[PDB]
Design a protein around this ligand. Structure first.
Ligand SMILES: O=C(O)c1cc(C(=O)O)c2c(n1)C(=O)C(=O)c1cc(C(=O)O)[nH]c1-2
Ligand SMILES: [Cl-]
Ligand SMILES: [Cl-]
Ligand SMILES: [Cl-]
Ligand SMILES: [Cl-]
Ligand SMILES: [Cl-]
Length: 298
């Protein structure tokens, strides 16, 4: 038949809907077999994608835009409008971004993470501060940063949303989300910065497998949003034995399910990007002043 190789991170949320697609036969329903390919980290996943070893990964719009500017045929489709979360210890004196001054601040995903670009942009706009000038920044993969915030080696951390949910039950609070920054900018609606990235070659030569997968994913998200029993099936993949954690993960995932037309999604992306290029020109030097053309999957 047709196999679609999807690269997933072991601490990512993409595995959850991939497991629904397989369990419910939504790949079969669309004439293909989904092969879930476990990749160690985001840097490993990005290389496998550059190396043509998968048909898709989950990644951010900026990286997709950068790969487009750098010459790739990558196509983006919205995966979630839920992204980022600045976590501080409960009762933290930090009530504003200025409070980060003189603190050890973890940043998940490195110096070019989409959440970091947004946070830096928000801080320059609302206070003319360069967080990298005042805060002791520590870059690293999300699991490490979550662990070090728990152990007190860090005073705050910008983490992927799933980790923030688990930290609340360890006595941690969300100072701000990446969704917060973007509503502060004045975005028209919920905006997906996390997407499926489809390989240019697969789009060109196996376009129906791509559409079949995109349909399978939307059906899985739809099922998760309409069948509360289905969640207890995927719980083993969620690392959520704790009950308040499980409920918080479910609530944030549901809130993130993209429900806006690609046209509206693409237009908010273009505007939010051009706003960020004015506040974070250096970090996006690999991407350009504007989003590549035809980046969004039709
Ligand atoms: O900022 C975030 O909250 C967030 C969440 C997730 C996620 O849903 O696991 C990903 C990312 N970011 C991300 O940038 C990324 O490349 C990614 C890959 C995967 C995955 O499951 O394979 N999740 C995510
Ligand atoms: Cl095949
Ligand atoms: Cl790997
Ligand atoms: Cl590509
Ligand atoms: Cl379908
Ligand atoms: Cl910059």
């Amino acid at each position: 038949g047709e196999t679609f190789r999807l690269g997933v991170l072991p601490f990512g949320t993409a595995s959850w809907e991939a497991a629904v697609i397989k369990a419910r036969g939504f790949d079969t329903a669309n004439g293909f077999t989904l092969d879930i390919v476990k990749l160690a980290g985001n840097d490993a996943a990005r290389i496998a994608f550059l190396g043509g070893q998968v048909d898709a990964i989950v990644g951010d719009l900026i990286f997709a835009a950068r790969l487009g500017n750098e010459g790739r045929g990558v196509r983006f489709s919205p995966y979630s409008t839920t992204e980022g979360a600045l976590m501080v210890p409960a009762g933290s004196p930090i009530t504003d971004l200025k409070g980060l001054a003189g603190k050890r601040l973890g940043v998940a995903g490195g110096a070019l993470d989409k959440n970091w670009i947004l946070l830096r942009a928000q801080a320059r706009e609302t206070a003319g501060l360069e967080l990298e000038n005042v805060a002791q920044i520590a870059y690293g993969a999300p699991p490490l940063l979550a662990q070090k915030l728990e152990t007190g080696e860090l005073d705050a951390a910008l983490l992927w949303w799933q980790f923030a949910a688990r930290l609340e039950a360890k006595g941690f609070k969300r100072l701000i989300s990446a969704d917060d920054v973007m509503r502060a900018f004045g975005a028209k609606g919920a905006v997906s910065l996390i997407g499926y990235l489809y390989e240019g070659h697969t789009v060109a030569d196996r376009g129906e497998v791509v559409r079949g997968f995109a349909r399978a994913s939307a059906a899985a998200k739809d099922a998760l949003a309409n069948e509360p029993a289905l969640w207890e099936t995927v719980r083993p993949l969620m690392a959520a034995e704790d009950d308040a954690t499980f409920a918080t993960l479910k609530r944030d995932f549901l809130a993130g399910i993209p429900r806006r037309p690609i046209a509206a999604e693409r237009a908010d992306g273009e505007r939010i990007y051009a706003a960020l290029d004015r506040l974070a020109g250096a970090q996006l030097l690999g991407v350009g002043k504007s989003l590549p053309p035809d980046l969004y999957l039709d």
